Structures are given as structure tokens and as C-alpha cells.
Amino acid sequence: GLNGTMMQYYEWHLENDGQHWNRLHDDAAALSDAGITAIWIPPAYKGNSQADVGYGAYDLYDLGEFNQKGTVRTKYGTKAQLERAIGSLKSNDINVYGDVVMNHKMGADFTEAVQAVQVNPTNRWQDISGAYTIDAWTGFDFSGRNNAYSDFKWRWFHFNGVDWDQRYQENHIFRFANTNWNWRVDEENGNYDYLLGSNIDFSHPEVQDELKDWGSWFTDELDLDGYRLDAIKHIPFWYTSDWVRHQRNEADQDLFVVGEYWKDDVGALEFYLDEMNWEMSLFDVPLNYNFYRASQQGGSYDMRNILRGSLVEAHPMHAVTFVDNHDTQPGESLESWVADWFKPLAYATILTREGGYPNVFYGDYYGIPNDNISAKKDMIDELLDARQNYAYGTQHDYFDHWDVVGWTREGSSSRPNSGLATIMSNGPGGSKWMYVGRQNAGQTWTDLTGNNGASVTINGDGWGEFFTNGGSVSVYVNQ
Ligand code: NA
Ligand code: NA
Ligand code: NA
């Protein structure tokens, strides 16, 4: 039972060469070795076009298998190549979590005439026009799949809103007259049901059942071990709960479930987790924003607050920790990018501490060429070494100075030579006496990261004095 580490295996600006599944296939053994235990794959199904990152969600039953939207393959490759990749993951002891997008659809085959009212963007409760007829992109027939797997077809009456009127060619937020916004949902802009595209109305039983059945079809087709659920703050809470329960029923395998409730507000997250009866984890979005505040502010940031307000502080067993993703990366919709100087500190925080299930971002591991962002594979690999081989046993925390902080793990007898001491500063360097466990007395610990040449000998009471340089992190272990 090595500590688990997941990886998001894509970034926004990946090349559209259709070879990503094959890359994943060939990378599997190396990822296992490095300490990755689970992979979050991008949406595997056909979006608006071939170059869709995956959130188009045109046809959930088309995994790069049918000629629809101007391509057989998705951006990532063919269904056959995806299944080959998954086999390779499975035989290297890596779990596969499928990205799941149920909030909306885009790329409809045809428009339909629809009575709609304009609502106020910042208050979707409030109409700002009378009902009139728009043309909405709501008709989905899936020509090319020809009823493989599912003969279900989507129509306007499965939706409650769009943001584009094709009749008079205008952007507005539209509620379909005589439909309701979903509920319960996040209450920013009054009701935050509507995000983009054609918004799915979960009030209809045909819909509830379709996404449950699609859910189970997908899980069985790819042999998934779990899911990331995107946009779950815009999807009615009762349905996400019903959906998750349904999948666990249908599936023989255990299913890990992580939801993205994108809010810088752990209370909002905790409520969601109340409503879900603690049947999934969430991404730790406030922590994302802690790291980003730190990155942006520089050393004046008080490092005692680095974990404060975070999901992982409060519910480590329900937290998926991360530094950045495809939406936080530069120029993206939720941009909150951790600069290179702070990034090792953030990664050490989520990889070497006992709480949270950490996620490594492909873009950090392999680089983001589009933006001249370097691959940080070596830095991350050392932290993975720390996590997999050394971050065990009782933990001691030292958030006791505004620049310099750290923590230790005493190791466990199950894992020989395990134990570690992390120290970092976001300002001038320094040192700190920290306890690593009386049982490690007399050992000599060195920095996995290479940022510090100090040798740290553990005293007879089990204390060492650990050193960090300025704007840096070190992780000392018994090598
Ligand atoms: Na929605
Ligand atoms: Na970030
Ligand atoms: Na500071």
C-alpha cells in the first residue's frame, strides 16, 4: 500500500495529432516506476470538432469510433488506441479515472424553434424579456454512429437554456419558457445552472435514465476505476448523488469519484459534501487559490496561512489536492497559475504530507510548449520518490514562521528508511529544529531535491536542524 498519486494526462494546448492515447500506452511503465498510481484521462468522447479538448460533449457514445463532427478520432486518438492504452495502464498497476461531462452539450446537428425568455446574466432568476421564439442548437441525431450502443436522440425539450439565438443571431442567457432552472445548484448569479452550450434539464426522467445508462455503458466499456465529475456546481445536487449511487450499484469494481466544485470557498464545498453524504472527494480549489495568492504576492505572503481555508486541512480524506490544471494554465478560463519559483513548494505541500490525494498536472510534468513552460519532470520525480518511498508514519507540523515552514514524517517499520523532513521558505532562507522520531536518532539525512547540500544528522532525542535557502524547498530523507 504505497501512497497514491494521480496524474491529469493532458493540458489545454496539447498537439492535435491523435497520438495521445498511444503516448499514454507507451508511458505507462515509466509512470508506474515514477510513483503514479492513477491516471485522469481527458474526455474520451466526440466534441464539437477533432481539436476539441473534450468539453464540447457532442456524443458520449462516440469514443473516437464514428465519423461525426468532421473526424473519426477524438483529439486524443481512436477508441481502439484508448482501449490499448488502458490495458497497458492496467497491467502496470495504474487505475484509470474517466473525465465525465454531464452538465451540457454542444455541436448539435440542427436548430429547433423554441420559446425562450432572456434572463439577467448576474441573476438568472430574473427575466429581462418576454417570451419569444428563438432558434436553438438542440437537435442531436448522431449520424455515423447509427444507433450503436444507444438509440437515444436529444431534442430541445431535454434542455432548459442556451446562450446563442440563431434566429436573430444574438448572445443572451436564455431560459426556455415554461422550463425551470435546475435545483439545487450553486447560487452565484442567483442560479448557476446555466454555464455554456445547451444546458441539460434533469427534471425529465428520460434524461436521468439516459445519463445513468450512458454512465454504466462507459464504465463497462473502458473498465474504469473512477471518474472526475466536471461542473458539478452547475448540475442539480440530488442528481449527481443519484448518478454516483447508480454507478456503484451497476459496477462490480470499486469506483473512486472526485468532483470539481470550482469555488474559492471551502464552506461551499463542505455543503456540497453534506448534500452528497460524503460519498466522493472534491478538488481542493481554495488551496489552488492559496498557492496562487502566494505565487503572486511573493515573500510578503505569510506562509503560516498556506493551508488555511483549504479543503485538505478540514477533510483530508475527501480532498484531491493539486497545483494547476488545464483551466488554471496561462490564458485559460480559470487562470491561477503557480509560477515556476513557487511551484516546487506547492508540489512538496501536496506530495509529502499525510492528508489529501494529490494530483500531478501533465503540463508541469512534461511542459507547456505553447507558452514556453519548461518540463519540471525531475523536480516532480524527486517529490514522487519522497511520497512513494519516504512519506509514511506519524507527522509533525511547523507552520510557525512567516517565511520558513516545514513538517516531518517519522517513517514506519513496514517501509525501511522511510521518514522525511520538508522545509521551505518563500522568502530568505533559514533553518528549523524539527522532530523526526526518536527512533531515527543518529541517522544522516540529505536533500532529495538537491536544493541544499547540507547533511542533517538526527540527534539522540530524534531532532534534526533542517536548512532551506531562500525561495526554495528541501526534502531530507535517509538515503
Ligand atoms: Na447546468
Ligand atoms: Na494554480
Ligand atoms: Na513570507
From TrEMBL:
GO terms for molecular function: calcium ion binding; hydrolase activity, hydrolyzing O-glycosyl compounds. This is Amylase. It comes from the Bacteria. Residues 4-408 form the Glycosyl hydrolase family 13 catalytic domain. InterPro entries: A-amylase_thermo, Alpha-amylase_C_pro, GH, GH13_cat_dom, Glyco_hydro_b. The gene is amyK38. It comes from Bacillus sp. KSM-K38. Ca(2+) 1 binds at N103, D193, H234. Keywords: Calcium, Carbohydrate metabolism, Glycosidase, Hydrolase, Metal-binding, Signal. CDD domains: AmyAc_bac_fung_AmyA (cd11318). SUPFAM superfamilies: (Trans)glycosidases, Glycosyl hydrolase domain. Its cofactor is Ca(2+). PANTHER family: ALPHA-AMYLASE.
